[PDB]
Amino acid sequence: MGAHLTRRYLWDASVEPDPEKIPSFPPDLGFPERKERVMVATQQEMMDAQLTLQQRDYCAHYLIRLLKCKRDSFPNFLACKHEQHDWDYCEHLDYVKRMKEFERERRLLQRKKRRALKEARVA
Amino acid sequence: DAPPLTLDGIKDRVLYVLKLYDKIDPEKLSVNSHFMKDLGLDSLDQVEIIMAMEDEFGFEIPDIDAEKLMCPQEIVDYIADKKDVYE
Amino acid sequence: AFCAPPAYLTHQQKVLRLYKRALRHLESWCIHRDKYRYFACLMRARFEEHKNEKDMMRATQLLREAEEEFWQNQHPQPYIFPDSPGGTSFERYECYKVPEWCLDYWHPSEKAMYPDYFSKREQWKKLRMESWDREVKQLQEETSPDGIMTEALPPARREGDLPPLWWHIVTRPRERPT
Amino acid sequence: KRLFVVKPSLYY
Amino acid sequence: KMELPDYRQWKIEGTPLETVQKKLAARGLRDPWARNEAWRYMGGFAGNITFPSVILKGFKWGFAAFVVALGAEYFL
Amino acid sequence: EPYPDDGMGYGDYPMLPNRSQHERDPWYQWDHSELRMNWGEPIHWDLDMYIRNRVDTSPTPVSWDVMCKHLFGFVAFMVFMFWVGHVFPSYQPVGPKQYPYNNLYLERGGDPTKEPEPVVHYDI
Amino acid sequence: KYKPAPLATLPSTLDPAEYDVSPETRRAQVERLSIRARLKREYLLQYNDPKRVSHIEDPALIRWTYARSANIYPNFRPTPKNSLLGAVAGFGPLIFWYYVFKTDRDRKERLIQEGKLDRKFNISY
Amino acid sequence: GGVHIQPRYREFPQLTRSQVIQGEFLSSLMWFWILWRFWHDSDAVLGHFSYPDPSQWTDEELGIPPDD
Amino acid sequence: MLKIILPSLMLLPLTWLSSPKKTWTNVTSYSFLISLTSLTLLWQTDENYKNFSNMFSSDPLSTPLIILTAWLLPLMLMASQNHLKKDNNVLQKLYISMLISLQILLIMTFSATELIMFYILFEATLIPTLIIITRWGNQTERLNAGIYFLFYTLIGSIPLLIALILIQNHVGTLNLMILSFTTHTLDASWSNNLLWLACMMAFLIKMPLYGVHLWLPKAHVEAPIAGSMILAAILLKLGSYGMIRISIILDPLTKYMAYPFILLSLWGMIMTSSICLRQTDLKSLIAYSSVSHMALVIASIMIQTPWSFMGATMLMIAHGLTSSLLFCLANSNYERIHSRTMIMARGLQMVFPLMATWWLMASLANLALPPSINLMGELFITMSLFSWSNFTIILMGINIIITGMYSMYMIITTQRGKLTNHMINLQPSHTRELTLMALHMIPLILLTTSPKLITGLTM
Amino acid sequence: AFFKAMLFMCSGSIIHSLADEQDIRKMGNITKIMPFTSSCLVIGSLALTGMPFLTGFYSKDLIIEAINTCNTNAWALLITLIATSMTAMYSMRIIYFVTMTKPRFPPLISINENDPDLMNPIKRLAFGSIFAGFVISYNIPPTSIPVLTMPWFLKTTALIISVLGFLIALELNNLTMKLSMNKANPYSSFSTLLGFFPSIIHRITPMKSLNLSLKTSLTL
Amino acid sequence: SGYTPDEKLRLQQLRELRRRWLKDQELSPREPVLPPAYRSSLFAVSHVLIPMWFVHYYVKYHMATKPYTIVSSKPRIFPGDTILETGEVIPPMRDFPDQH
Ligand SMILES: CCCCCCCCCCCCCCCCCC(=O)OC[C@H](COP(=O)(O)OCCN)OC(=O)CCCCCCCCCCCCCCCCC
Ligand SMILES: CCCCCCCCCCCCCCCCCC(=O)OC[C@H](COP(=O)(O)OCCN)OC(=O)CCCCCCCCCCCCCCCCC
Predict the structure, then answer these.
(1) Chain J residues closer than 8 Å to B3 by CB
(2) Cα distances (angstroms) measured from residue K91 to each of A41, A42, A64, A72, K74
(3) Residue B77: active-site member
(4) N vs C: which end of chain G shows fewer Cβ within 10 Å?
């Protein structure tokens, strides 16, 4: 349920990002040595906390915390609340990234259209 | 769950309903009093009566067995016979 | 279920049996009582008029267009009572209506208890065999001359005799053995 | 009014 | 033996059957079985039931209880 | 009305109306109650089919054709619309999820010895 | 208009005949009750008979089973629409599945022979 | 005896103390719980994370270069 | 194995010499113990076959049956004590002896090393069976049924006689042990393609295949209960036992000479299963149930994969016990009802509470309910058939749906619904009737606990 | 499991208390005649409609917003949401007809739900229906990495569609009371005879599967 | 219509007999001739503890003893815990940037 779809399903899809292939353009385009992501947890930490593969996100590190405070504090299931906000935040702060990336793409494709339309296609 | 019927509690309800039908005078309704020859009601009003009874006692008096619920009493033994009330 | 089916149906019973299906299929569409008690006295009007049509042909032309009006203006899931054929409790309790000729193979131990019960049961079985002769003879002496024969059976017509063929309308399993 | 409940013979 | 309320008690006025009674009457018609259908609206079951009333049944004390609890937490 | 003489065995067995026991008057005291059949009345050839359990030829408030068309119409429209759907899906404005290491190459059970072409994910 | 199909048949009501009945029709109708009433008063006087242990037979059911499993081959005449249809039913699918199973079994065998079928972790058969 | 709760004809069935109190009890706890959780945890409707406006991201941030 | 046999023979002297009043108990009590001696063969502590002596052997495939053959004689003699209790005291002692000879002969046939010993004993079993069906058969048509049972088996039998004498000349001995450890590889000629058919056809006939199964519906219909139990439980399985031991030779041809039968059986399984769906005679429906559930077996003794074979061994022993149970309870209804019609007698649970529990368990055995050897069997044949061609599940998949429908219909229209108004009042159940059943199912429950014993030669 | 179990035993109470009436048409005003079951029924009804902070709410809206956020069939996404509004509608249908309406039951009234065996279990499950979603969601292991970040319309869609669902049905039912029989059966029949899958696929298949056995495979 | 005067007597009389049959069906006093504990604590323990013991006997002395009969997912170990057997203290995780 969204309006972005309308831009793509209706109107023109030339400048609308493909749901897949989101990292379509060069990974460094527009970037002065963009820093790659940083994963706080060690591959082993996760493997020892038995985090489901899917849950091994870049927020895996705040999860392990939650899970820690959920095993500890056992009889009390209502007290590891700060830990959940944190994890969630980490993830909201990841969903936003995944949204910034998508927009980026979107805009860049438009850049392609504008540029290749009159800059590189008319004499 | 509810208490079982009686041959005088299945008769007070049958007279009760009929006494609430406007056409049937409530002071000339007597159990041995025929609906169409003595009280005056027409044929269409027999269907309507029976139907009231079918809704007072919660079951369906079949068509063929109900083209004859004339006396205001037949209704009281037929209902009871169908419900096994030996009093 | 009790009385026997007539051979052909009259005009009346066909009209007067629509007044039932119709009004009862008007209480599915119109559930609330008020709407019903209204929309129904308006139904009678429809039947009330065209009551005195003497022109049979016409009458059977109002009936045949009534039952088609009805078929197309009927409710798919009407209100059929709980215990009537097609209902929700129809024949539910029949798993408990054993046919009473089965208490005759009970072990003398079982029938040992419940003793006064079998003392009265043996009386009734004496009644049944004591009249089969007078009954069948009645059924026959009063059999109709050759011609139309319906399923209606005769009453007693003499003291001491028991209505012919009465062993299974009486001695019929109780409706709700519970 | 306890009533007698006919039942198939159940000794056998 | 169970007694039965006096048949007279029932009357159509004062219930929704009365308004149905008056219109059918304009048409000249009059339904004769109304009085039977009167106890539906006659008493006890006479009050109209509103949809918020069912969804909100017990809300009054529920919130009262809500207040009390929050209070205890405030009192620490 | 004997079943048609085409030598399939029917013989003299009467061709009784193909109506199921379902619409036999449900109130009458049928000798055989559950077959809704009286004692002596010619049994139908396929009474193993039009019995009160197996098949139901009984009139329906909606005409049969109207039924077959409507049902299948619904089915088709749905199936189709589902197709319109797959063509035009609903997807939020979100780029792809990013897993650490090499898309968890080793942990997805990848071969420890053979390192994978690094798949890197950058900030923003 | 309701449209009876071989299923969803025309209801009693809505059936032309039920409405226009000639004197002839009525007579027939009356007769059919007689046959039934007659048969009804025979069962009833054999059912309600004290002093009876023998099995009420319901010969109408015995005429049915005989008609259906022991009066068939004495009324068999091999026509067309019967032998064409009596061979499509016995050999039709029996030949269909043979080219369904042969083709599969042959596809399988080829693949096994050429070395493609994986047959992994299959240590049973 | 045969009457544990006298049946009633065309009258509002009499109700036992307990029937009414238990019914108000279950419903009132439902409302206390809905109100208590709503106060303590109101992130059922709102959500505790605000959607970013994807259309306010400086192109610089998104690496959008300036037409070479 | 002469204790399972000699003590058996001696039963015959006991049925004759014993008092007319005590003849029944001496015979039934003693063969129960004869079954107990039969259980000793089950003591196999190593995989090598127990070759008792030159002519008599018992390997995993025969042992599960010899015990069943010994077990049913007690039961057969208990199910026929009612009918056959109206006889002259010398007709009984003949029936009892006839039943006794069947298992003497059947015990030996299942426990025979020389394949032609199988043939002589194999085709002898027809004499006792034809007498049981024709002499005591209630219906006018048993003379006909007997003819069908004798000719279909006999015309198949003489080809096998020629084939086995043929292999003896080709190899030099019909000893199943040697024939197995010797190189008999047919050469896919046109002639061999006939040999294979000669050997398998006689076995395929008494194991009703779709093409030649008309003998079994006709035979069980008019056969007395003891004959119908023997035909379904042990007689039909004689054909399966033969196909397992005879296809040791004719090893190469069945790879490609089986397609015809396999397809005949799987399509046959569907049609035989389906006609059960509308058949008015209960004994008729059980018989076609027997054809379909035996059509699965000829489709596993031909695919020839380890699992098929023991799927077959599991199902044959299991279906044998279940079918009899169904044929035995069908008889109890027939004797009180006096008619085979399924439509009459509706509602019995209302009047015979327990027999209905036996009916329910028999039907659940009939359809594949899972903690039963019956299901393990079909699950295995199903697996291999799938291996032969993944498409097989479609046909072995229409049979499972149909098998559920007719199995429950037998329960729904015989043991539920409103009671029949007043058939001859149905006298209560005898304890013999109920035990005859209990004796069938208690072993079905016990075998399901440890399926290993009836798994076949393959596993 | 908790709420559906409640509603069915709730109706078990209504059906048994009334003279075995299993039809909403003849049952009415159970709210005043039997508050204990009516209270249990609405608690269950709201849980079915995903009332906020009740057991349905903890799990159900997670599923709804999951849909609103994943890549999915457009036809599937739209039908699932209106399916949620219909769940509110039929939920509304039950309480309006069964509970909030003038009584239409047979005239003699004999209602008792006092029996401990009725109340106790209904009472016990009601406690579960009220608190189970709270307990199960917090206790279970973190799983699935949900997406709590949504445009607010999608975040609150389950809540609004459910609300609008009730509102629409309230209107429809309330409209019914008018002395105006004008339903016209526009599409009620499909809906009333189960989409006609029962009328057609239950009469053809069992007929053309048995005809072929008797007539063709068995006799021919 | 109306009942025929000779059917309102075959229902008159047969109903009279049905009423007597149902009276006779009633059971007399004595009719069912009979042929000549700490409350829940007789259950909780007798019916739960008694079974438990057996089960335990079975689970701690057959299953436990036999190989691979009761296998369990590894216990969860997070950064910072002390493994009981080894005594190893799982090293703390790289500080993830706080207040993110
Ligand atoms: C009931 C559910 C049915 C579900 C069916 C599922 C089918 C899955 C797809 C099957 C087809 C593609 C398979 C691709 C991998 C296997 C390739 C293969 O080796 O299969 C070959 C087989 C050849 O069959 P055919 O087309 O007849 O070729 C004859 C050539 N002269 O290829 C085929 O067999 C094509 C036909 C497949 C389906 C066959 C029929 C299945 C249902 C039969 C019901 C009973 C029909 C009885 C017909 C009687 C006719 C008188
Ligand atoms: C032999 C060849 C065929 C002969 C057939 C006719 C033979 C009749 C005469 C002999 C009858 C008895 C001998 C043959 C059967 C022997 C069965 C047996 O010995 O059971 C063994 C079982 C102990 O189990 P065990 O053998 O240790 O299992 C191996 C585990 N590794 O011992 C036991 O524990 C017995 C336990 C009895 C209670 C079992 C309770 C569980 C029942 C589960 C039923 C599940 C549902 C079944 C559904 C059926 C269909 C409805």
Answers:
(1) 110
(2) 12, 11, 14, 18, 19
(3) no
(4) N
Residue I438: both structure tokens together: 């209990």
Tell me if chain B has a CB within 8 Å of the CB of F27. yes
- What is d(CA I84, CA I93) in angstroms, rounded to the nearest whole number? 10
Expressed in angstroms, the distance from the first to the final Cα of chain J is 51
J40 vs H26: CA distance, rounded Å: 7
Asked whether J177 and C35 are in contact (CB, 8 A), the reply is yes
Closest ligand 1 atom to residue G89 Cα is: 51
Q: Please, do chains H and E touch (3+ CB pairs < 8 Å)? A: yes
Residue A82 one-letter amino acid: H
Residue recorded with tokens 């393959």: I458
I444 Cβ closer than 6 Å to some ligand 2 atom = yes
Q: Which method was it determined by? A: cryo-EM
DSSP track, C100-145: SSSTTS--TTGGGSSHHHHHHHHHHHHHHHHHHHHHHHHHHHTPPS
Helix or strand holding residue H8 (H, E):
strand H8-9
Mutant choice from C27, C35, C37, C42 vs E, greatest count of E C-beta within 10 A: C37
Distance of alpha carbon I266 from alpha carbon I374, whole angstroms = 18
Instruction: Say how many Å lie between the CA of residue I451 and the centre of ligand 2.
Output: 8
F40 at interface of C, judged by CB pairs closer than 8 A: no
Q: How far apart are the first and last CA of chain I?
A: 23
Q: Domain range spanning residue I422?
A: 2-459
Range of the domain at B75: 2-87
Mark yes or no for CB contact G68/I280 under 8 Å: yes
Chain C partners of J101 at a C-beta cutoff of 8 Å? 32
Is residue G105 within 6 Å of ligand 1 at its C-beta? no
Amino acid at C130: E
Nearest C-alpha neighbor of I352 from the set K93, A54, D10: D10
On whether any CB of chain K is under 8 Å from the CB of B86, the answer is: yes
CB atoms within 10 A of CB I351: 24
Q: What is d(CA C81, CA J25) in angstroms, rounded to the nearest whole number?
A: 11
DSSP state of K47: I
Q: Do C102 and D5 touch (CB under 8 A)?
A: no
Run of H or E including J109: strand J108-109
Q: Which of I278, I280, I343 is the closest to F35 by Cβ? A: I343
Q: Please count the structural domains in chain I.
A: 1
Q: Give the number of other CB atoms < 10 A from CB of residue J96.
A: 22
E35 to chain B: which residues are within 8 Å by CB? 20-22
Instruction: Tokens 């392609």: give the residue.
Output: A112
Which of these, I321, I302, I312, lies nearest to I361 by C-alpha position? I321
3 state DSSP class of J108: strand
Whole-number Cα distances in Å, B11 to A104, B87, G43, H38, J19 = 86, 12, 36, 58, 19
Q: Whose CA is nearest to atom 45 of ligand 2?
A: I371
Q: Which two tokens mark I63? A: 């042992």
Inter-chain contact A31–H63, Cβ cutoff 8 Å? yes
Separation of I380 CA from ligand 1 center, angstroms? 23
φ, ψ at I279 (rounded to 5°):
-135, 125
Which residue in the list B8, B25, B42, B55 is annotated as catalytic?
Answer: B42
Distance CA I342, CA I328 (A): 15
Secondary structure string (H, E, C) spanning K33-96 = CCCCCCHHHHCHHHHHHHHHHHHHHHHHHHHCCCCCCCCCCCCCCCCCCECCCCCCECCCCCCC
| Total count of domains within chain B | 1
Sequence length of chain K is: 100
CA distance B9 to B13: 6
Q: Are J121 and J127 in contact (CB under 8 A)?
A: no
- Structural contact between residues C54 and C5, judged by C-beta atoms closer than 8 angstroms: no
The protein residue with its alpha carbon nearest to ligand 2, atom 24, reads I450
Establish if F92 touches chain C: CB-CB under 8 angstroms: no
**Closest Cα to atom 29, ligand 2: which residue?**
I450
